[PDB]
Design the sequence.
């Protein structure tokens, strides 16, 4: 009954039939993206219309199309042909990944490069990577992937240990042509293996770890209704899943007495970029937009009980479309559980004689994705005290290169002859705010130091200042950890019992933002990543910080274009976009498989409640 | 047998007898501090000598003494009379806290102030607070406490809800004189109660939380031998306890193959200061040195199974001295357990077909202390992958004041008429480093941005730079979150298999440091807190960043004095001192009892190992 329910297999099958009958899904067509559209603002008329947005690619070279379909009515709402040299190419298809290695295997230039290195072409894996936009005029309007080669010594070998440096190829995956093969010189292929399940590398496995058993003898404290509606410890929300963004949280609200109070209308990771900092021409083009170019949701893992998710786990199994419009279930793709989280509040009072301890817990919603060598976990946490937190977990195998004789300023050495280029992993969280409703505003809060003098004779005072962001042109903000900078999202029309506007404070980790030169291609295509915080006025079509069509888009799309409208954001329907990321200088300990590292952000209540919201937690 | 074993009740009883027989523990004497001295550098001669350091106060006004005793030999090693106007007063005694309220109850000025406010003196609690050093010349060389008043409506009432603003008194606790009573005007006493166990404030307790059961059916994976020696998942360490510092970690080492590799010789929180930022003369003197003035170990809580520590818990019960030299056990004062910690490493490889997941865990060592209204948890964590982390948890009841009509730049409003002054909680971690032995050095690592141009034609490259700190005068460092600044502690004489020096990287949270004017009394007494990182050359007597005698010391003791020696720290026995803290602008949600907030730091291996140290973790 809920408009925010997950897409069903039946809905996707109906979309396929509607597209086929309309003549839009012939044998040459591929679905590059399919997802449900959110209800438009003002759905308080019960007139639900389940609409789907579809990107249709054509493998014969005809123009792709963007199509909107109503499964409720069984109709095509609109269908637009796309000029991809103007607005960008469609996301990469899973089936194009295979084309790259097969095409290169028959190319004379590729074979002569492998022959010079005495490599058997049957053992050479090619990583198919997105192209970006650089100096190659012949690439405008064509679908290009670039390939980097790795040697697999046997079928279960980790090819990442054996990069073939000095060699790169570019491939037109529609015309099936190899456009360029660049060979800058022979580097030795690193010889040590990286097989982290091989007993001679691991040694004998430890026998010292005793089991930890986490159970819930009465079941979990949360309920799931309507497939994806969660109620847990006064929280209420809907768990969505989109093939591009992955897990999306809708309608995050908190039950305060008999009032259901909204906090966040929609929360998602709306882009993530992985730029490489190696100036070698073999890799200086390398930038992954995992969300916008590859679609992180379609590579979500099936999560295993006891290994990936431990405890009393409730699973969701979202359904997505394959490239032909058939529904595909991602079995056990989302884990949901609660976790003990230590002490919530504690005080032993000498005067009253009362000793008081309460324990905290959090609700966890998570999925894991694998894009080539990298694996990312996305974790959303809700806490008893009203805190909302996101955490990204990065693991997998680092991308490798040769390590040059005589060292490098831009590459770490991991093993003899084996290097790992410097890079970043940068995320954009899109937070469509609804603090007690939709009239919100953002204030920037800095600590204020005071000078010793009149009215501060002992030089101990310090204060804070808040600056309201009133227009989009002034709402592009930088972190300042030294001044304790945070941002408060408040509702100026909703007051707590002290007559102060209710609010939530965003605490950033204050990690470095995009390091590339501001004149670079990546700085233009990932402009969101150059600043810590952006605030826009909500609009239906402003969904991604990088635009709708990220693949091979020349630049400037998304946030820099949106904020040029300079709209009023002072007590309006607003969206916060927070950039955060990891700067990765690989260490020896990251090899041959990397222990998890993390980054994230959190939001804490700031006068949202009239007192602590966890006074009614029992003693346990 | 180990020299690092905890003090026994028998040792403390022997110290008492040795002091008594030597004529140093008559009826007028009080022990203000007692603790075991660590072995001096070079204990590889098996000639153990258990020595104790004792601060002896005299309640008749005679000079206090510092005494060192050998329990091994049964002798007084040295005894020095202290000139407290020069070197500082002894720590505050628990028994002096009671003196303040009792003395004020008979003072004519105090009674007339309470009469003007129609307060019954029997209901007025006085918080006895350390004095600092300000403008009062008569306080030099005297033991002073300052008192602030709160009303307790009935014996189980939370007095913190009822501050009596506009009134402060100073008391000489040795001569038993009230030196000054300052009344700056009548403020209404806030009337709402703050009783967080009262059903009419909490409402009905939730019935929605289902149990989480954490058990270890085969017992824990760590072993405890010799009372306090821990072995866990290749880690080896000794857990100490000192009445001033609390939990101290000794001899932190990691078993790498058949080599036991040292990492940290001694880790402790060696000071913690809580400065208040309210310029009102009622509170502008208020600064707690919880470690140096009050001694956090002596107020450690007895931790309850299932409430404070959940799971399969192993307890330590440290023994301390009371003020008369009798041993006192802090039952269940230290909790030790392991915790599941999510995914350690994960990769699903398309080419090899291998799916790999491993889970992480951490070892937890924790204690909790209560100093008046505040309660602090101290948590040390050891992880499978070699990471060491500290986390402080702050909870309890915020210190309150009146909220002035017309608002304040330095006080938050929590309830009608009830304010909470701004303040910080700042910690100093003292890390006596021993990375693969004692020849260590510190490098500061910044990210380096590169300009687009020759050798970086696409403007994507970025790098890093490391600066060796060679002398103490250049080893006082500030955070810079924007440049990703971290510090690496390395051993230049111990190389990994790539011929790089082994090392560990310190990751700070980059929170603001001390905000007070640099010319203030607190900036002089807590100079450590004005900078994020200090490195000194190890010396036996340089124990605390604030000096040995913090109470009423005029300033400049500790780190600023140590580093003036300008000693060589490049490949030497060095000590890292890291300042970190919380800046607290109280929110409504902090009242009437504050949910936990946290701050800390961590150290991660940086080429310490030759590859990932967790390849031998089994599948579980
Ligand atoms: Cu990385
Ligand atoms: Cu505080
Ligand atoms: Na264009
Ligand atoms: Na909004
Ligand atoms: Na002095
Ligand atoms: Na050292």
Sequence:
């Amino acid at each position: 009954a809920s408009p925010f329910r997950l897409a069903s297999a039946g809905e996707i099958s109906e979309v396929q039939g509607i597209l086929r009958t309309a003549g839009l899904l012939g044998p040459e067509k591929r679905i590059a993206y399919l997802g449900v559209l959110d209800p438009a603002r003002g759905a308080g008329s019960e007139a639900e219309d389940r609409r789907f947005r579809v990107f249709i690619h054509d493998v014969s070279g005809a123009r792709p199309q963007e199509v909107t379909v109503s499964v409720t009515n069984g109709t095509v709402i609109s269908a637009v042909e796309l000029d991809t040299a103007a607005t960008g190419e469609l996301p990469v298809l899973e089936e194009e990944f295979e084309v790259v290695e097969q095409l290169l295997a028959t190319d004379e230039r590729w074979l002569k490069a492998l022959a010079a290195r005495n490599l058997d072409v049957s053992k050479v894996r090619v990583a198919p990577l997105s192209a970006g936009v650089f100096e190659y005029a012949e690439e405008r309007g064509r679908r290009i992937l670039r390939g980097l080669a790795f040697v697999q010594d046997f079928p279960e070998d980790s090819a990442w240990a054996h990069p073939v440096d000095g060699l790169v190829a570019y491939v037109d995956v529609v015309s099936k042509e190899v456009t360029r093969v660049i060979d800058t010189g022979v580097f030795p292929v690193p010889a040590e293996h990286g097989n982290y399940t091989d007993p001679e590398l691991t040694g004998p496995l430890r026998t010292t770890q005793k089991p930890i058993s986490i159970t819930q003898p009465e079941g979990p404290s949360f309920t799931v209704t309507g497939g994806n509606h969660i109620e847990w410890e006064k929280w209420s929300l809907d768990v969505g899943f989109d093939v591009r963004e992955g897990v999306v949280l809708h309608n995050i609200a908190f039950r305060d007495g008999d009032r259901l109070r909204p906090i966040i209308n929609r929360a998602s990771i709306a882009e993530m970029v992985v730029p490489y900092g190696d100036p070698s021409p073999i890799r200086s083009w390398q930038n992954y937009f995992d969300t916008g170019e590859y679609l992180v949701g379609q590579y979500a893992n099936s999560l295993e009980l006891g290994c990936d998710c431990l405890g009393d786990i409730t699973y969701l199994s979202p359904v997505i479309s394959d490239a032909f419009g058939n529904p595909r279930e991602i079995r056990n793709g989302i884990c949901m559980h609660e976790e003990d989280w230590g002490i919530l509040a504690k005080h032993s009072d000498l005067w009253s004689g009362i000793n008081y301890t309460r324990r905290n817990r959090r609700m966890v919603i998570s999925f894991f994705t694998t894009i080539g060598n990298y694996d990312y976990g996305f974790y959303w946490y809700l806490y008893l005290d009203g805190t909302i937190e996101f955490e990204a977990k990065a693991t997998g195998v680092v991308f490798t290169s040769a390590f040059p004789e005589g060292g490098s300023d831009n590459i770490s050495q991991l093993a003899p002859g084996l290097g790992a280029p410097f890079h970043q992993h940068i995320f954009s969280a899109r937070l469509d705010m609804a603090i007690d409703g939709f009239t919100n505003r953002v204030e920037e809060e800095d600590v204020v130091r005071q000078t010793m003098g009149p009215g501060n004779e002992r030089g101990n005072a310090f204060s804070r200042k808040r600056t309201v962001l009133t227009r989009e042109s002034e709402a592009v903000r930088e972190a300042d950890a030294r001044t304790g900078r945070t941002w408060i999202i408040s509702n100026p029309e909703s007051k707590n019992r002290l007559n102060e506007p209710v609010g939530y404070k965003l605490h950033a980790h204050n990690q470095p933002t995009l390091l590339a030169d501001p004149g670079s291609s990546i700085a233009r295509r990932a402009a969101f990543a150059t600043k810590d915080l952006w605030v826009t006025r909500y609009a239906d079509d402003e969904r991604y910080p990088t635009g709708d069509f990220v693949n091979q888009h020349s630049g400037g799309a998304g946030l820099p274009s949106y904020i040029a409208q300079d709209r009023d954001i002072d007590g309006q329907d607003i969206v916060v976009w927070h950039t955060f990321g990891l700067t990765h200088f690989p260490r020896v300990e990251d090899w041959p498989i990397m222990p998890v590292d993390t980054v994230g952000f959190k939001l804490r209540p700031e006068g949202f409640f009239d007192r602590s919201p966890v006074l009614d937690v029992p003693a346990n």
